[PDB]
Design a protein around this nucleic acid. Structure first.
Length: 1171
DNA sequence: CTATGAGTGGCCCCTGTGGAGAGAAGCCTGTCCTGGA
DNA sequence: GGGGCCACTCATAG
RNA sequence: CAGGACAGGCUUCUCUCCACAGGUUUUAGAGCUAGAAAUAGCAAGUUAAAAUAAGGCUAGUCCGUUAUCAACUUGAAAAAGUGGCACCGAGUCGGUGCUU
């Protein structure tokens, strides 16, 4: 007899809870059959549990890395092109020169020729490096002199130029002076005359650095002898040696040298330079990020112009060289892939290889742009075979206005029931008021159309309250451009103007927008064409031209747009028109609903919107529910599923923050009283852009440094996050702030310095009074006073996870409703055996709180399944003995807490590079670079592990020994291992392989040991805690109340009763401490740490209750699942215990756990490995 | 007399920005509409 | 947060 | 009860593509003098080349960190199938009965 049962689930980023209950709020218990060769044949499990899993990763890192690979590859390709163009000439003077350049990184033994790269002999190399201390000296000497030089010199020069060409941010009488001021900002020197002033500026820096170094050496040796060697010889310290020969930065060097100059007299000029960040500065600095590539282009032009008389090929290929330095892949064409890549959409005019000298000819740029723009366009929900139209299209805005005008019923004198506006009325109103005014209110219509044209002095309007929000913006702009209303009113130009708007919306560039309209050059004058070219439009709608005006109703021959213009007495709007059975439009909608191939559950789940983690979670959830319905006996439940929660906030504050952003910035400027607003016009559409919004927030003063802002400099200004990037991922505006480029590039993963905070706190306080900056934004400035980045600051819940845990309502809804019911009735109406029930967390939260079912996450991982069970019971209840039954249900220790096993994928190892050492644990960077001579990567990640039984040769005697040990397979070797395990094991050094004994052991492969102690295989040589502490509900409640001794929210009576319970049960602390000690001595085995914790507890017996409870909460980290984590107990700090022993699980028993852990196959190793 | 597993503590982790577009989700205001119970 | 590696010490087989 | 689009405003995030600066490692940049050597003293200190996941064949200025994954039988793979129930209790599940 099919019993009636329900299912409850709690969904999170990393967890999936599942629980099945009967009608009486009781979870059924079932005894199953276990597979394997073990003694135990039948075990009993309850029908509750949860599945833990890792968080899904966003693709941002992968996309950034892919862009990095393409960037590096194209850089090397440019280098290769330059090498090809010099190869024919260079081989005449030196054939092996490029061979030396390509083989610099090798050691002398591995090098084929002599170790000196440039000249090949020590004399000329030393002469080079003494004549030119830096490459910029060589650049300057070539650019200013008129003497023939060596081709190697110019090769090194141009190679340096091409590799670091510079930015493209700048495009394209007084303008010459402004350019000179721009260079003056760029270049520290102004007086010296030359065609390559960058070299002059940097050589100036070099000379002053050298002179100041000499002065410091002399004076320091004169006055302070003992610190001389530390400054100029101790590389380990943070002195000059660390600044140059060490890993120290410029700011660190300044910080360390400031006390030295403070204790030292005569440091006036040195302190002045240090306050200007202009002392002892290097060649390669973080300040070069603002260098425009135009300077490099001009210097290249000058050097080629000077050197062209010496070599014909230079003047023959100078245009090509300029192209290489200036060429760039258009941002809309995309990857230049010939079909094989899944990211490409470029169209090929021919089949030749794409080169920077023929890219324009070979690829259809217009078709490429159309393909790029069309990829991300949403398709019509009703006509999947048609595209949406630009939001600035005349037809779309006519749709908007007429739909707004469709439900404008008017009440007059001499009438009884409100009447729809006639089509003639609509047309007259539009032509008389909308074609003349950008914004129209109800007063305008009443006083200008009904009273003036219709002679209806008093008219009442229904369906419009404030005004007609929609506008003829594009129409009015085109009226200003063309000034021909007859052309606009002509219906034979509808297609012409539609393609005009389409072209204005598609292409962002100027050459394309000019080119495609060239066909229509016979319509208007040149000035109209130019102004149209200057015009731009962005955005797309949700409807299609075919629906509104393409298709015609068969019995009437009328379009939907025509119906909107005049629908008679009915005057249906868009929704009634699409939902009216009297027209074939609904039939066309139904027919166009293509019944495409049923997408696989992976495809349906993946085609959704959101992070990969949320679809991973929904896939896990559906797999779990499928397994539960399968095992139960293939009978469907009645009431199931989601808990989904929001905080809706109050409507008033959200509305008031939403309204008047433009007027909010205006009121802020008014409060400050600065004349900025009158200086520069303000527009809400401009406030939509982020950059101008930040500029107006700054009120002309930079946060970091005293500076006067500029409109043009806004392009050079860069937004930086005050909160460090890697420490915490945030793109919120309150975190974001505008600052000058040097300040942004100066600090990476660093909070602003304390001194800057001190000097700018006054202006920041004035901004806070102005209310332009939020309190959190002020706190990011204040974070320096807090002490910088800290552990507790990073331990903050990320908002994206919350967004997703709100986001997965509807998707679960339709997938359950779809797989749930695949059959219809005779009327084709769908009948449901199960109904999806959705509830918010507030109901179950008050259910917990009013009935003492509190929540502590850090006790153990039992809470997910408990919340799922509570969700089930509350969902059943909404649609005494029950509470007692729930109390018993939440008490069993036998809960199928199982973590899913994965094959680790991602990075091969850590990204850092370590110097060479005499060890075997390093990783070669290539197939031929021994880490002994070159270092390499370290700490490679392991993919999974196998248990290998074979014979190994031990000792110098090479005596074979039968062994049974596990060897970890890294991600570096997954393909090799899966390709041919036998050959791989033979090459490694294992002979007589027992292929049947290889067991695929991914991460978290749980191994069961003596006394119920369990361990998950963390890695090839690491283990993590496998058991969990079953804390009784009484201790849970007492601990939660003790932790909340002073912060209970409620009536005084209930709080006082809870306080009395807390104080009367003081002995519970000793009980839980002894329970933790017993659990440790049983499964954790942390005798040293256990003794430390017990000694600290005895020391702190008289401490206040709250601090004790907080510390007890800190203690469960030792007893929690997973890896151990460091924690602090009162004042005492306890280190982590790392299980680096892997000899013990070689004799234990494996248990493979099903997705819910109800079906398992226990396998004994002690029987395996027989000889 | 010397090498090597096994235990404990302390230590280390690549970064930053510009340009261009599209989409999605959330909140609010107004409009109306659609199917039900 | 959490796993990999080296400095230090130490028992045991060869 | 639920959904929709409209238009406006606000906030947040995702997805895809094009560029720029660094950073790290190895080597080149004659180190000198007293002293057999340890050592001592002195001199100099800015730069260059290469690499930036092993590599792969579909050979492209293409791709390589997203997604998927208990065990057994079948299938190359996708995929399909494979495993009893009722009652009483509870410290990692156990106790009783029926049939297989």
């Amino acid at each position: 007899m099919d019993k009636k049962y329900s299912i409850g689930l709690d969904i999170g980023t990393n967890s999936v809870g599942w629980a099945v209950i009967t009608d009486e709020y009781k979870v059924p218990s079932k005894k199953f059959k276990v597979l394997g060769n073990t003694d135990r044949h039948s075990i009993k499990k309850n029908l509750i549990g949860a599945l833990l899993f890792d968080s899904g990763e966003t693709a941002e890192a992968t996309r950034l890395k892919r862009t990095a690979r393409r960037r590096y590859t194209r850089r090397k390709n440019r280098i290769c092109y330059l090498q090809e163009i010099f190869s024919n000439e260079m081989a005449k003077v030196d054939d092996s020169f490029f061979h030396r350049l390509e083989e610099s990184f090798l050691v002398e033994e591995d090098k084929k020729h002599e170790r000196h790269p440039i000249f090949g002999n020590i004399v000329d190399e030393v002469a080079y490096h003494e004549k030119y201390p830096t490459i910029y000296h060589l650049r300057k000497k070539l650019v200013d002199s008129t003497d023939k030089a060596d081709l190697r010199l110019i090769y090194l020069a141009l190679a340096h130029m091409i590799k670091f060409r510079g930015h493209f941010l700048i495009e394209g009488a007084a303008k010459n002076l402004s350019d000179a001021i721009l260079l003056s900002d760029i270049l520290r020197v102004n007086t010296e005359i030359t065609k390559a002033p960058l070299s002059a500026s940097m050589i100036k820096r070099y000379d002053e650095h050298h002179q100041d170094l000499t002065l410091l050496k002399a004076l320091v040796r004169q006055q302070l002898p003992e610190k001389y060697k530390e400054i100029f010889f101790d590389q380990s310290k943070n002195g000059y040696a660390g600044y140059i020969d060490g890993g120290a930065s410029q700011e660190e060097f300044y910080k360390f040298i400031k006390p030295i100059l403070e204790k030292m007299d005569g440091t006036e000029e040195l302190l002045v330079k240090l306050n200007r960040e202009d002392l002892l500065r290097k060649q390669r600095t973080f300040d070069n990020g603002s260098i425009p590539h135009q300077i490099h282009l001009g210097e290249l032009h000058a050097i080629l112009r000077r050197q062209e008389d010496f070599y014909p090929f230079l003047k023959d290929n100078r245009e090509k060289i300029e192209k290489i330095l200036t060429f760039r892949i258009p941002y809309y064409v995309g990857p230049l892939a010939r079909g094989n890549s899944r990211f490409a959409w470029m169209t090929r005019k021919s089949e030749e290889t794409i080169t920077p000298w023929n890219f324009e000819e070979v690829v259809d740029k217009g078709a490429s742009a159309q393909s790029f723009i069309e990829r991300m366009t949403n398709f019509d929900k009703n006509l999947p075979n048609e595209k949406v139209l630009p939001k600035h299209s005349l037809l779309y805005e006519y749709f908007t206005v007429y739909n707004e005008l469709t439900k404008v019923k008017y009440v007059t004198e001499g009438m009884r029931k409100p009447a729809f506006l006639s089509g003639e009325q609509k047309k007259a109103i539009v032509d008389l008021l909308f074609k003349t005014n950008r914004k129209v209110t109800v007063k305008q219509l009443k006083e200008d159309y009904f009273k003036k044209i219709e002679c209806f002095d008093s008219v009442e309007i229904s369906g419009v309250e404030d005004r007609f929000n929609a506008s003829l913006g594009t129409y009015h702009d085109l009226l200003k451009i063309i000034k021909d209303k007859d052309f606009l009113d002509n219906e034979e130009n509808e297609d012409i103007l539609e393609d005009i708007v389409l072209t204005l919306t598609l292409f962002e560039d100027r050459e394309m927008i000019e080119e495609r309209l060239k066909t229509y050059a016979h319509l208007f004058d040149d000035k109209v064409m130019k102004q149209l070219k200057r015009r731009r439009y962005t955005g797309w709608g949700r409807l299609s031209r075919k629906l509104i005006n393409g298709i015609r109703d068969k019995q009437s021959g009328k379009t939907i747009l025509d119906f909107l213009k005049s629908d008679g007495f009915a005057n249906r709007n868009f929704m009634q028109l699409i939902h009216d059975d009297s027209l074939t439009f609904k039939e066309d909608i139904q027919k166009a609903q293509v019944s495409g191939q049923g997408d696989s559950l992976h495809e349906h789940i993946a085609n959704l919107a959101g992070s990969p983690a949320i679809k991973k979670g929904i896939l896990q959830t559906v797999k779990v529910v499928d397994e539960l319905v399968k095992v139960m006996g293939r009978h469907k439940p009645e009431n199931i599923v989601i808990e989904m929660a929001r905080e809706n906030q109050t409507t008033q504050k959200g509305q008031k923050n939403s309204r008047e952003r433009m007027k909010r910035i205006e009121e802020g400027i008014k409060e400050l009283g600065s004349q900025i607003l009158k200086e520069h016009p303000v527009e809400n559409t401009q406030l939509q852009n982020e950059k101008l919004y930040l500029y107006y927030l700054q009120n002309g003063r930079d946060m970091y440094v005293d500076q006067e802002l500029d409109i043009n400099r806004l392009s050079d200004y860069d937004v930086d996050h005050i909160v460090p990037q890697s420490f915490l991922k945030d793109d919120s505006i309150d975190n974001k702030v505008l600052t000058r480029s040097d300040k942004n590039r100066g600090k990476s993963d660093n909070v602003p310095s304390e001194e800057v905070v001190k000097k700018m706190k006054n202006y920041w306080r004035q901004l806070l009074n102005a209310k332009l900056i939020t309190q959190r934004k002020f706190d990011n400035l204040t974070k320096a006073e807090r002490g910088g980045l800290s552990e507790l600051d990073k331990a903050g819940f990320i908002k994206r996870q919350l967004v997703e845990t709100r986001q997965i309502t509807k998707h679960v809804a339709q997938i359950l409703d779809s797989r749930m019911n695949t059959k219809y009735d005779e009327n084709d109406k769908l009948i449901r055996e199960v109904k999806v029930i959705t509830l918010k967390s507030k109901l179950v939260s008050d259910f917990r709180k009013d009935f003492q079912f509190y929540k502590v996450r850090e006790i153990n991982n039992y809470h997910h399944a408990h919340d799922a069970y509570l969700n089930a019971v509350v969902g059943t209840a909404l649609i005494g003995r029950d509470f007692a039954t729930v109390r018993k249900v939440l008490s069993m220790p036998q809960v199928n807490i199982v973590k899913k096993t994965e094959v680790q994928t991602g990075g091969f190892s850590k990204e850092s590079i370590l110097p060479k050492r005499n060890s075997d644990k390093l990783i070669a960077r290539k197939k031929d670079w021994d880490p002994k001579k070159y270092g390499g990567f370290d700490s490679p990640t392991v993919a999974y592990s196998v248990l290998v039984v074979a014979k190994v040769e031990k000792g110098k005697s090479k005596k074979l020994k039968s062994v049974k040990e596990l060897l970890g397979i890294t991600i570096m070797e997954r393909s090799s291992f899966e390709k041919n395990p036998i050959d791989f094991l033979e090459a490694k050094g294992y002979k007589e392989v027992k292929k049947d004994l290889i067991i695929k052991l991914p991460k978290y492969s749980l191994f069961e040991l003596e006394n119920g102690r369990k361990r998950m295989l963390a890695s090839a040589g690491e283990l993590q805690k496998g058991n969990e502490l079953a804390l009784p509900s009484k201790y849970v409640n007492f601990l939660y109340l003790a932790s909340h001794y002073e912060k209970l929210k409620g009536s005084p009576e209930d709080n006082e009763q809870k306080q009395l319970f807390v104080e009367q049960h003081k002995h519970y602390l000793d009980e839980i401490i002894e329970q933790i000690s017993e659990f440790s001595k049983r499964v954790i085995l942390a005798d040293a740490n256990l003794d430390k914790v017990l000694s600290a507890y005895n020391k702190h017996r008289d401490k206040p209750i709250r601090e004790q409870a907080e510390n007890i909460i800190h203690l469960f980290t030792l007893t929690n699942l997973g890896a151990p984590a460091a924690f602090k107990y009162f004042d005492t700090t306890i280190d982590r215990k790392r299980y680096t022993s892997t000899k013990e699980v070689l004799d234990a028993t494996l248990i493979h756990q099903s997705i819910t852990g109800l079906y398992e196959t226990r396998i004994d190793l002690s029987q395996l490995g027989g000889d």
